[model samples]
Structure formats: C-alpha cells, structure tokens
Target: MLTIGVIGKSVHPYWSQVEQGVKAAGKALGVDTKFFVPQKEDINAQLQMLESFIAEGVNGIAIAPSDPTAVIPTIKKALEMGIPVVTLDTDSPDSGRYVYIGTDNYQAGYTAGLIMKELLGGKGKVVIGTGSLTAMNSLQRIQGFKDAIKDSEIEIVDILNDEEDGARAVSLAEAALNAHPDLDAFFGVYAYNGPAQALVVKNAGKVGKVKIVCFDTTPDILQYVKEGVIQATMGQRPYMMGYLSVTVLYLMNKIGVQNTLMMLPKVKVDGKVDYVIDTGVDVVTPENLDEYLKKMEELGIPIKFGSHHHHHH
Candidate 1:
C-alpha cells in the first residue's frame, strides 16, 4: 500500500476540514494518507515537516507552504528523489511541484476588496490584519485588495502582522481600533483574522460601526457574518484543495507525470505550463448566508452557528 503525506500550516478548524477531504480522497483512491501540522505558523516548522515527510519515504507529499520561496529547495528535492509533490492552499510556483490545488488567492482578495467598497460606500478608512507578512497567500491577497481599492476613496490606515499568532491577531485588531477612533472597516487577510477582528470590534462596541471583510468560512467566521459583525468574507475551497492534492498524487503514481499534468487545468508562467486546479471562491454575507450554508452542508462540510464563549477569571 502506498502512503501519501499531507501537511498543513497549522492546526485550525479550517485545516480540519481539509483533512477530511484528504482522508476521503485517500480512501476512495486506495492509498494511505498521513496528515500533519506544525505547532504554529512557522516557516522552519513547515520546512522541517516537509523534510520529515521526505525522510519517511512516502510515495507522495502535499504541503501548504508557510513561505513560498523558503519551500522551493525542499519541494525540488522531493521531486528529484522521484516522489511526487504538490501544493495545497498556498503555492510555491518557482518550486517544481506537480500542481497547486487552491484558490486564486489574489482574485479572492480582490473580491473581498469589492465587497468592502460596497460596505463602506466606496469611502472609508480601513485597517488590514494578517497572520503573516511574507507568506505568499497573504502577500497576494493583500496586494489584490490594495489594487482593488486604490482607484476608490478607500484608504488603508494600517496593516498589522500578528506573525500567525491568534492572540496577537486579536490584540492587533484591538490596537488598530484604539489607534484609529474613526476606523470605518477592517480587511482580514487570513482565515483566523476574520473572527479575531470581529471579536474585538464587537467588544469595543463597534460591530456594525466598524465593518469587516475577510477570508474563510469557518464556523466562527460564519457566526460573525450571520450576526452582521463581519460584512463579508471570501470563502476559499479548502476541502477541495485537500481532496485534489491527494487525487493528483494518486493519479501521478497510477498514470504518468506528464499525463497527470496534462489532465488538469493549467496556469502558465513565462509560456510554460504551471498546473493549477483552482478550487474557486464564494462571497459569503448575511443576505446569502443561509444559501451558502446549505451549499456547504450539501458538500458535507459541517456548519455550526454561535459566538465563542470566554471564561472570566
């Protein structure tokens, strides 16, 4: 039996859903799947995990890179060793990975920007919060957001980096709110940022006043969207990313690399084939929350709605 290793950036509700798809694909494709995650969002941790996967002599490996450039050497090494490697959630395009199965993060971010424009009436001061400053997904999403709002009256007053720490993400949102008394909106560039920012905004008595647009459709984020705490969020297909990552590797091992590469949709760079399986995006908001939830439920993604409870000492 062939075993494929799957690694994610961190342990989160989002990655749990991805793991579901990974396991489902593995079972359907008749392969063994081992999923791993770092303790936190650290590049070295991800690199170390990738190396460990390589050393384990898995038939194939899939990863969501913490740093695009940092993972290139390791990805190349995996391919050179005759192990099929692919990227999920985030891509290291320069790395010779077989394929990337995830959102067009830039386009997703741009969609978030468009929603924010409508939320703020095309004129407001906004603060951006993210878990990483250098991660390719975050960088691309942030850039797309900036470009989308640049031609409008939307102004970015601050961009906070929490270094992938959830507590720090909340603190940064609080700081941004405190620093800018009249802040009109927030753009959360990562999955956890949405709920973190919303929690602070609600506690600060600015839920409806300070709008939020972010990424992900995790239950926590969906709860905020349902409550109007978050105006909108870009929903990436993480489950699809997980499913396809495993399926692509299985196909590569069953068929041939060139045949598998030719089968999926391709994104070209410098006139060369760059295999990309876009999982697509959905704009989730209060108006369409029910419809989106129904769609997700039908896709076998569990949905729960409620605010998180905190214990006071």
Candidate 2:
C-alpha cells in the first residue's frame, strides 16, 4: 500500500475540510494516509516532521509549509531521497516539490481588493490584518490586494500582522480602530484574523461603521457575515486542495513521471484573471446567508453560519 504524509500549520475549520478530503482521497486510492501539524508555526518543527515522514519510507508527501524558505532544504532532501513531495496550500517555489495544490493567493487577494472597492464605493480607509509577514500566502494576498487597488481611491492605512494569534489580532484591530477612527473598511488575509478583526469592530461599536472583507471561512466570521457584522469573505477551497493533492500524487506515481510543478485549479471573479485556476469566491451577506447556508449543507460540508453543525458523509 502507498503511504502519503500531509503536513500543515494549525487546525482550523477549513483545515478540517481539507482533512476530510484527504481521507476521502486516501480511501478512494486505497492508500494509507497520515497528517502532521505543528502546534506552533515553527519551521524547524515542520522540517523534523518532514524528515520523520521520509524516514518512515512514505511513498508520497504533501505539505503546507510554515516558512517558505526555511523548509526548502528539507523538501529538497525528501525529493533526493526518492519520496515524491507535493505542496498544498502554501508553497516553497524553490523546493523540489512535484506540485502545488492551493489557491492562487495573489489573484485571490486581488479579487478581495476589487470586492472591497465595490463595497466601499471607491473611497475608504482600508485596514489590512495579515498573518505572518514572512509567510508567502500572506504576502501574496497583500500584494494582490495592493495591485487591485493600485489605481483606485481606496487607501490602505495600517497593515498589521497578527502572527496567527487571536488575542493579538483583537488588540491590533482595536488599535487600528482607535488610531484611524475614520477607517472605513478592514481586510483580513488570514483565516482566523478575519473574525478577530470583525470582533474588534463589533466590540468597538463600529460593526456597521467599518465595512469588512476577509479571506477564508470560520464559525465566528460566517455568523458575523450573516449578522452583517462583516460585509463579505473570499472563501478558499481547502477541500478541493486536499482531495486533488492526493489524486495528483497517485496519478504521478502511476504515470512514473517526475514533474517539477502542477498548478491547482482556481475560479476567478468577473474581471480578475491572473491565477491558473480561479477556485471561486462567495460574496456573503445577510440577504443571502440562508440560501448560502442551505447550499453548503447540501454539499455535506459543515455549516458555520447559523448553528455550527456537521453532516455525515
């Protein structure tokens, strides 16, 4: 039986979906699958995990790197050891990974920027709540947002890094609110930081005052969008990423090809088109939450909008 190893950062709702997808793919492929996630966003820990998986003689490995550059050596080592490595979510382009299965983060960020412009009517103070500055995903999102708003009237004022800390996110968001009371909009490029910013706005009594656009979906952020606390979100297809990564590895193994890259599919909005595959985005609001929630439930995915519930597959 083929063994595949999956690695990522922390476990969130989206990550749970990814896990489900990976397991489903594993079952379909009739392969043994294992996952590893570092409690902290430590590159060294992730490297150790990769090395351990390699030593176990796993046939394939999938990783969502914590540090883009620091993990390159380990990934290269895995490739040298004849283990096929595929990167999901975040990637180290310099690494000898066979493929990357995740969002075109830069384009996704650009999509978010265009949506922000539409929501803010072209003029507003936009506060950016980011993950780690060192992370490729965060940086790409920020770049995409900036590129989208390059010629627009929306002004990005404060760019704060939450370091994946919810409490820090809250504190930083509050500080941004206090510093720029006229801040008309907030953008969250990370998964948890989006809701963290929304909570700060709600706590500061600026929920409606500050329009929000964020990335990823969480229970709190989904509910906030339903309640109009957040304007909209740019959701990622974590499930597809998980499912496709395994399938790709399986196919590569069967084909016996050693490719350097395989780009995942993404869905684009009406105007933006810089990504390989535009994984699509949902513009959620109070008006469409019920319909959106129903559709999500029909897909056998967990619902985060109303009551946090799960459906068995």
Please list the C-alpha lDDT of all candidates, in the order they appear. 0.88, 0.78
Which parts of model 1 are misplaced by more than 4 Å? Answer: 304-313
Global CA lDDT computed for model 2:
0.78
Cα lDDT tens digits for candidate 2, 1-313 = 8888888776556677788888989998888888776653567777888999989988888888878888888888888888888788887766777566788788889988888888888887999997677778888989999999888888989899866766778899999999998899999988877898888888888878898889876677788887788887877777777777777777667765333233444334575322232344555666777777776677655554574455599
List the candidates' TM-scores in order.
0.95, 0.87
Which numbered prediction scores highest in TM-score against the true structure?
Answer: 1
Cα RMSD, model 2: 4.3
Error of 2 at 300 (Å): 5.0
lDDT of 1 by residue, 139-226 (tens): 9999899888888999999999887678888999999899999999999988779999999999999889999999999989988888
